[PDB]
UniProtKB/Swiss-Prot annotation, chain A:
Taxonomic lineage: Eukaryota, Metazoa, Chordata, Craniata, Vertebrata
Extracellular side: 1-469
Protein name, as recorded: Glutamate receptor ionotropic, NMDA 2A
Protein task: Component of N-methyl-D-aspartate (NMDA) receptors (NMDARs) that function as heterotetrameric, ligand-gated cation channels with high calcium permeability and voltage-dependent block by Mg(2+). NMDARs participate in synaptic plasticity for learning and memory formation by contributing to the slow phase of excitatory postsynaptic current, long-term synaptic potentiation, and learning.
Subcellular location: Cell projection, Dendritic spine; Cell membrane; Synapse; Postsynaptic cell membrane
Disulfide cysteine pairs (residue numbers): 54-287, 396-422, 403-423
Organism, as annotated: Homo sapiens (Human)
UniProtKB/Swiss-Prot annotation, chain C:
Interval of the full protein contained in this chain: 25 to 499 of 938
Ranges in the topological domain labelled Extracellular: 1-475
Organism the protein comes from: Homo sapiens
Protein name as catalogued: Glutamate receptor ionotropic, NMDA 1
Subcellular localization(s) per the UniProt record: Cell membrane; Postsynaptic cell membrane; Postsynaptic density membrane; Synaptic cell membrane
Domain-level remarks: A hydrophobic region that gives rise to the prediction of a transmembrane span does not cross the membrane, but is part of a discontinuously helical region that dips into the membrane and is probably part of the pore and of the selectivity filter. The extracellular N-terminal domain (NTD) is a site of allosteric regulation to modulate overall receptor function.
Function statement: Component of N-methyl-D-aspartate (NMDA) receptors (NMDARs) that function as heterotetrameric, ligand-gated cation channels with high calcium permeability and voltage-dependent block by Mg(2+). NMDARs participate in synaptic plasticity for learning and memory formation by contributing to the long-term potentiation (LTP). Channel activation requires binding of the neurotransmitter L-glutamate to the GluN2 subunit, glycine or D-serine binding to the GluN1 subunit, plus membrane depolarization to eliminate channel inhibition by Mg(2+).
GO biological process, one term: positive regulation of calcium ion transport into cytosol
Chain segments annotated as coiled-coil in the UniProt record: none
UniProtKB/Swiss-Prot annotation, chain D:
Post-translational modification: NMDA is probably regulated by C-terminal phosphorylation of an isoform of GRIN1 by PKC. Its phosphorylated state is influenced by the formation of the NMDAR-PPP2CB complex and the NMDAR channel activity.
Topological region Extracellular: 1-100
Disorder cited: Neurodevelopmental disorder with or without hyperkinetic movements and seizures, autosomal dominant: An autosomal dominant neurodevelopmental disorder characterized by severe intellectual disability and developmental delay, absent speech, muscular hypotonia, dyskinesia, and hyperkinetic movements. Cortical blindness, cerebral atrophy, and seizures are present in some patients.
UniProt-recorded name of the protein: Glutamate receptor ionotropic, NMDA 1
Gene behind this protein: GRIN1
Subunit structure: Heterotetramer; the NMDAR subunits are modular and harbor tiered domains that function in concert to regulate opening and closing of the cation-selective ion channel pore. Forms heterotetrameric channels composed of two GluN1/zeta subunits (GRIN1), and two identical GluN2/epsilon subunits (GRIN2A, GRIN2B, GRIN2C or GRIN2D) or GluN3 subunits (GRIN3A or GRIN3B) (in vitro). Can also form heterotetrameric channels that contain at least two GluN1 subunits and at least two different GluN2 subunits (or a combination of one GluN2 and one GluN3 subunits) (in vitro).
Segment of the intact protein contained: 699 to 798 of 938
Cysteines paired by S-S bonds: 46-100
Positions of glycine binding: 34
Source species: Homo sapiens
Glycosylation site positions: 73
UniProtKB/Swiss-Prot annotation, chain E:
Function: Component of N-methyl-D-aspartate (NMDA) receptors (NMDARs) that function as heterotetrameric, ligand-gated cation channels with high calcium permeability and voltage-dependent block by Mg(2+). NMDARs participate in synaptic plasticity for learning and memory formation by contributing to the slow phase of excitatory postsynaptic current, long-term synaptic potentiation, and learning.
Biological classification of the source: Eukaryota, Metazoa, Chordata, Craniata, Vertebrata
Source species of the chain: Homo sapiens (Human)
Protein encoded by which gene: GRIN2A
Family: Belongs to the glutamate-gated ion channel (TC 1.A.10.1) family. NR2A/GRIN2A subfamily.
Listed name of the protein: Glutamate receptor ionotropic, NMDA 2A
Quaternary structure note: Heterotetramer. Forms heterotetrameric channels composed of two GluN1/zeta subunits (GRIN1), and two identical GluN2/epsilon subunits (GRIN2A, GRIN2B, GRIN2C or GRIN2D) or GluN3 subunits (GRIN3A or GRIN3B) (in vitro). Can also form heterotetrameric channels that contain at least two GluN1 subunits and at least two different GluN2 subunits (or a combination of one GluN2 and one GluN3 subunits) (in vitro). In vivo, the subunit composition may depend on the expression levels of the different subunits. Found in a complex with GRIN1, GRIN3A and PPP2CB. Found in a complex with GRIN1 and GRIN3B.
Length: 469, 50, 475, 100, 50
């Protein structure tokens, strides 16, 4: 019935107000139309926010609050959670300081941010690893708020999966500014893919130690969490490229899109509440005072945030306030220090990949390597067979090699997606046997021009032509 | 017709943390079958008649 | 070199006594120059007025820390969350008096919170130490659906997993549910005979009331009850045999405040020699930035050591809380509390008073009663398990082998029809063969009570793929 | 030999009794199970026969939970029964019978 | 292969050179003055194990 929205000074005021007014008028006409109370102020202080909350409470009993932000401070999220707990007013989290979520939702609070928990980030990283066929893990962590339960969750997820990940133990750093035990801890790392659960400040020192120990090679890979990569525009020179990270930064959805989604979710929740109970919610005597006892006779909005669908999208929330289908775009640090989207996660909680494997080289130092060499094979003899990956979250069960094949789409277009394929046979076994003796990486491709071929017009075709060229 | 079809095993130590690895390694070797060549080139019973 | 330290206190008497204490402390120990000009504020019941007063009287008064004390009324909550949240904007450290709740233990919710009161993780460590010194193997845990309970359970699991030991059964409670009979009987039908509770006073009372109903206060049972679960009506509703806990010099508000101010009076000098100090703004309005010296303040506070405290040396963990706190075990004897087990830290100091146990036992019960009730599951195998239907009398027909010896038979329980999608009935079958003979031999040798059961699906059971295939569960 | 699952999965039955009944009724040309069970079935019913020498040789056992304190006391009893001649007597009285 | 150190007082390439060492028995052809620093580097990297 009465919804207010708070915005920063990034854009203009009149256009934002007009868009917020037009939002609910697009479709889904509620029986009780919601108003718009939009304020744009650069000041971000707790007293200003509580005064604004009091004013909107006096503003025809505002029922919902939307707060935008432009900074990266996490204290504003904590104070908003406190306000929601002491006011029983649903508040949504938008881009800005409240983007990162780290505090557990209070049982008496009604808060639903647009962020995602580390557990969802953990399974997104696991799906990315499954796509990359990286079955070797290296878990290095540090004493950080809530990281122990993250380690427990990732362990109880990897051991419960049919992939069969590596049994490498967790190498947790003791304390910062050691310079003696850090090398001892890094000695125990003997893997190829390393997962990092670290802070932004300690990331610089750990990457400096890795550069000193030469852990930024072609074979080695690095995974960076969302909190470290929160400041996309802040790329220090000491960070090597290739730091794959997952976040939901404003690369595909803007502030206007986020506020549209928020107002749509609020309208759907209000409509569901009205359909369930015909009772307009009311505020307390004061903003969040305790003159009388705190009681809420009406039912909480937590059950109403389960069956929520807006414009055909199931943008609901779980019991902990986490998004059921978050964005979770994957950003990869380019060679020239830029972040680009290489996949999404909204497709029914699945993982999407652009299929670009080789993107790493000597960034921290200057030493080229040729450890990745492409291999081309055919399927005309009973020695190489390629099979489609089974749709059971497994990479061709066991005893397989990743493969690439250009599957033609139309009779005219020659565009082929890099679909992963099985690899079995006598030649595959010979290559696997040679792998131990050569300790070398493999990139397996297929011939895109019929059979092996021969010299035609003084030009070789097939595998011979690929080798020559 | 062996009276006691026992075996040899590996003599561990009481409380030694190797019962979670040695048995698994032995079972993996048995399942993958790495003892056939050993028993053919180390037992090789000559006296066989049919 | 003039600094200020804030303080939120229940009454003006505490405010003036602590002001006198800090004024005296400014001239004690080293007393190089002028140290502290403290300012005190009261716990305003109105949250908005309290927050505004705190902002005006602390942010604009050049303060570096806030001394938040316990609420005057124990029954009411008066959560110190708002002041910690306000201090978190500039990474302002805050000193907790007796906030034992594990809400502030995690730094994610409150980045800047350094309390001198040990959390319930220390209580879990004390329970682990008691288990180690008493050699308990079968241990179960009862944790309610609260953040502090989850934190305590996680701490106990982390501290116990290092000794290749895991809790046999963990159950979840709710704040208000009274039908805990199912969970209580589930705990009863277990080998472990030790029950530990960790919840609010009302939840502890309503879960211990059913203990007398289900005869859980008898002999052979050991109860591990936390510090806050013995107070209130628990003393009246709990008979003898309760092994509670208490913190020595934990409720001493004056002593805790004196220790905190003595710590800060030297911490300020240990931090003021840096290159620069980020002064707070001259008012609640005007500045929205964040101090860059917050981590430095946290490090200098956690790394500092003070042996002048009442409890001894003062050191902080990774969460900046009390380490090696002094614990006193309280034993409920004749509806009275007797101090017997006093533990300085990482050391056991037994006392001459006898430790009573529920049921009147004068000796420590081992708590290892398997009751010889080993459930047996059998798979229908023709050469080894001969399954035949039973007669109307409940016993199968008796036959003899080739040598005339009486063939033993065991009453079998399982589904009537093995076909899927059928009205399965748990009629009594009659399975006999090779395995039952050795089972009877084991029963007659090492006192086993065998009860053979069948399998509905008739499969040995391996890893299977189903809906939500990320869950690898054996069938 | 990964091509086996392209045929094995499409012909899995529900029980060993059903499988042996189908084999007797000329449904399945072959069946895979433990050597002792097949040998006993062939000895009891002359219409069946066991082929092949041996492959993937293994043994039986008794499974208990990792926290059960009845491991050594059961292993010692099993070894005592094995060395006291009980196992051979049980095999004679339950496996050794008339041979076709 | 022979992993020859370039020059003394580097503190950056020494760890890179020591990374390539993945053996159990190591032969040292070094001087007395540089022995102290190379042993300190080995202790920091934990190469003095059993
Ligand atoms: C000293 O503290 C008193 C209250 O305790 C306060 O009124 C006064 O402004 C303070 N003076 C300075 C210089 O901070
Ligand atoms: C508790 O629930 C059980 C259901 O298993 C029921 O049999 C019992 O009567 C209930 N007791 C009370 C006091 O409600
Ligand atoms: C044990 O509990 C039952 C109720 O479950 C009660 O009937 C019985 O009297 C109790 N036994 C004793 C000795 O009090
Ligand atoms: C606190 O301790 C002091 C001495 O350590 C004592 O004199 C005082 O009575 C105690 N306060 C309380 C409330 O027990
Ligand atoms: C703990 O030890 C210190 C020094 O050893 C001692 O002064 C103190 O009294 C001890 N605590 C108790 C409760 O005895
Ligand atoms: C254990 O078995 C022996 C064998 O005779 C018997 O005397 C004894 O009573 C049994 N004890 C229990 C507790 O079953
Ligand atoms: C195993 O047997 C011994 C005596 O042979 C007995 O002392 C011990 O208690 C038994 N183990 C268990 C778990 O009962």
């Amino acid at each position: 019935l009465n919804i207010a929205v708070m915005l920063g000074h990034s854009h203009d005021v009149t256009e934002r107000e007009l868009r917020t007014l037009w939002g609910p008028e697009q479709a889904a006409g509620l029986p009780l139309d919601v108003n718009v109370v939009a304020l744009l102020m650069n000041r971000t202080d707790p007293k200003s926010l509580i005064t604004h909350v009091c004013d909107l409470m006096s503003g025809a009993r505002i029922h919902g609050l939307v707060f935008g932000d432009d900074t990266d401070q996490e204290a504003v999220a904590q104070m908003l959670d406190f306000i929601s707990s002491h006011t029983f007013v649903p508040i949504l989290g938008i881009h800005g300081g409240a983007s990162m979520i780290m505090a557990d939702k209070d049982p008496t609070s009604t808060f639903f941010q647009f962020g995602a928990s580390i557990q969802q980030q953990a399974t997104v990283m696991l799906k990315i690893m499954q796509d990359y066929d990286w079955h070797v893990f290296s878990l290095v962590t540090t004493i950080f708020p809530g990281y122990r339960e993250f380690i427990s969750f990732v362990k109880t997820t990897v051991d419960n999966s049919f992939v069969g990940w590596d049994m490498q133990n967790v190498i947790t750093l003791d304390t910062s500014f050691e310079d003696a035990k850090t090398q001892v801890q890094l000695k125990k790392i003997h893997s190829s893919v390393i997962l990092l659960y670290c802070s932004k400040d300690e990331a610089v020192l750990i990457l400096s130690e890795a550069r000193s120990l030469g852990l930024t090679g072609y074979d080695f890979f690095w995974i960076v969490p969302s909190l470290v990569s929160g400041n996309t525009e802040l790329i220090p020179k000491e960070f090597p490229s290739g730091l794959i990270s997952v976040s939901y930064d404003d690369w595909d959805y803007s502030l206007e899109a986020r506020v549209r989604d928020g107002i749509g979710i609020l309208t759907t929740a209000a409509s569901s509440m009205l359909e369930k109970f015909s009772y307009i919610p009311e505020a307390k005597a004061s903003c969040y005072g305790q003159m009388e006892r705190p009681e809420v006779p009406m039912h909480t909005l937590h059950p109403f945030m389960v069956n929520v669908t807006w414009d055909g999208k199931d943008l609901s929330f779980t019991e902990e306030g986490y998004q059921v289908h978050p964005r979770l775009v994957v950003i990869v640090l380019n060679k020239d220090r830029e972040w680009e989207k290489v996949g999404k996660w909204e497709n029914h909680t699945l993982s999407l990949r652009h299929a670009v494997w080789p993107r790493y080289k000597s960034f921290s130092d200057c030493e080229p390597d040729d450890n990745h060499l492409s291999i081309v094979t055919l399927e005309e003899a009973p020695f190489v067979i390629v099979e489609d990956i089974d749709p059971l979250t497994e990479t061709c069960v066991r005893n397989t090699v990743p493969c690439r094949k250009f599957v033609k789409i139309n009779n005219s277009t020659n565009e082929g997606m890099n679909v992963k394929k099985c690899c079995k046979g006598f030649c595959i076994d010979i290559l696997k046997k040679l792998s131990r003796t050569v300790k070398f990486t493999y990139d397996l491709y297929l011939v895109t021009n019929g059979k092996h071929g021969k010299k035609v017009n003084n030009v070789w075709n097939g595998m011979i032509g690929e080798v020559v060229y | 017709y062996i009276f006691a079809t026992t075996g040899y095993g590996i003599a561990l130590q009481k409380g030694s943390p190797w019962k979670r690895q040695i048995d698994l390694a032995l079972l993996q070797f048995v399942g993958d079958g790495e003892m056939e060549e050993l028993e053919t080139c180390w037992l090789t019973g000559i006296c066989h008649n049919e | 070199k003039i600094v200020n330290i804030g303080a939120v206190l229940s009454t003006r008497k505490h405010e003036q006594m602590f002001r006198e204490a800090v004024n005296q402390a400014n001239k004690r120990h080293g007393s190089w120059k002028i140290q502290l000009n403290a300012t005190s504020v009261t716990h305003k019941p109105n949250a908005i007025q309290m927050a505004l007063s705190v902002c005006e009287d602390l942010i604009s008064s050049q303060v570096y820390a806030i001394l938040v004390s316990h609420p005057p009324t124990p029954n009411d909550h008066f959560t110190p969350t708002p002041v910690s949240y306000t201090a978190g904007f500039y990474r302002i450290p805050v000193l907790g008096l007796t906030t034992r709740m594990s809400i502030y233990s995690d730094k994610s919710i409150h980045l800047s919170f350094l309390r001198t009161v040990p959390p319930y993780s220390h209580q879990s460590s004390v329970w682990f130490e008691m288990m180690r010194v008493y050699s308990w193997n079968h241990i179960i845990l009862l944790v309610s659906d609260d953040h502090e309970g989850r934190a305590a359970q996680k701490r106990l699991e982390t501290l116990l997993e290092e000794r290749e030991s895991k809790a046999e059964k963990v159950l979840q409670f709710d704040p208000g549910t009274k039908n805990v009979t199912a969970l209580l009987m589930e705990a009863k039908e277990l080998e472990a005979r030790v029950i530990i509770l960790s919840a609010s006073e009302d939840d502890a009372a309503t879960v211990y009331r059913a203990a007398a109903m289900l005869n859980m206060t008898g002999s052979g049972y050991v109860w591990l009850v936390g510090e806050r679960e013995i107070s209130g009506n628990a003393l009246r509703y709990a008979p003898d045999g309760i092994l509670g806990l208490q913190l020595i010099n934990g409720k001493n508000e004056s002593a805790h405040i004196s220790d905190a101010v003595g710590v800060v009076a030297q911490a300020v000098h240990e931090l003021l020699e840096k290159e620069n100090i980020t002064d707070p703004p001259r008012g609640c309005v005007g500045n929205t930035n964040i101090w860059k010296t917050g981590p430095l303040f946290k490090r200098v506070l956690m790394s500092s050591k003070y042996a002048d405290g009442v409890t001894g040396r003062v050191e902080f963990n990774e969460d900046g809380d009390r380490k090696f706190a002094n614990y006193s075990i309280m034993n409920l004897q004749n509806r009275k509390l007797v101090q017997v087990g006093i533990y300085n830290g990482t050391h056991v100091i037994p006392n001459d008073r006898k430790i009573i146990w529920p049921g009147g036992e004068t000796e420590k019960p081992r708590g290892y009663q398997m009751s010889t009730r080993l459930k047996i599951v059998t798979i229908h195998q023709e050469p080894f398990v001969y399954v035949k239907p039973t007669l109307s009398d409940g016993t199968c027909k008796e036959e003899f082998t080739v040598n005339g010896d009486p063939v033993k038979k065991v009453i079998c329980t399982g589904p009537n029809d093995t076909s899927p999608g059928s009205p399965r009935h748990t009629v009594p079958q009659c399975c006999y063969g090779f395995c039952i003979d050795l089972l009877i031999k084991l029963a007659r040798t090492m006192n086993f009570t065998y009860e053979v059961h069948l399998v509905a699906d008739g499969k040995f059971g391996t890893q299977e793929r189903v809906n939500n295939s990320n869950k690898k569960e054996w069938n | 030999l990964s091509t086996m699952y392209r045929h094995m999965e499409k012909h899995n039955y529900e029980s060993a009794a059903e499988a042996i009944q189908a084999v007797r009724d000329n449904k399945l040309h072959a069946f895979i199970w433990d050597s002792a069970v097949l040998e006993f079935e062939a000895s009891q019913k002359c219409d069946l026969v066991t082929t092949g020498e041996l492959f993937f040789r293994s043994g039986f056992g008794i499974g208990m939970r990792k926290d059960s304190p009845w491991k050594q006391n059961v292993s010692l009893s099993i070894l005592k029964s094995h060395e006291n001649g009980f196992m051979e007597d049980l095999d004679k009285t339950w496996v050794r019978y008339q041979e076709c």
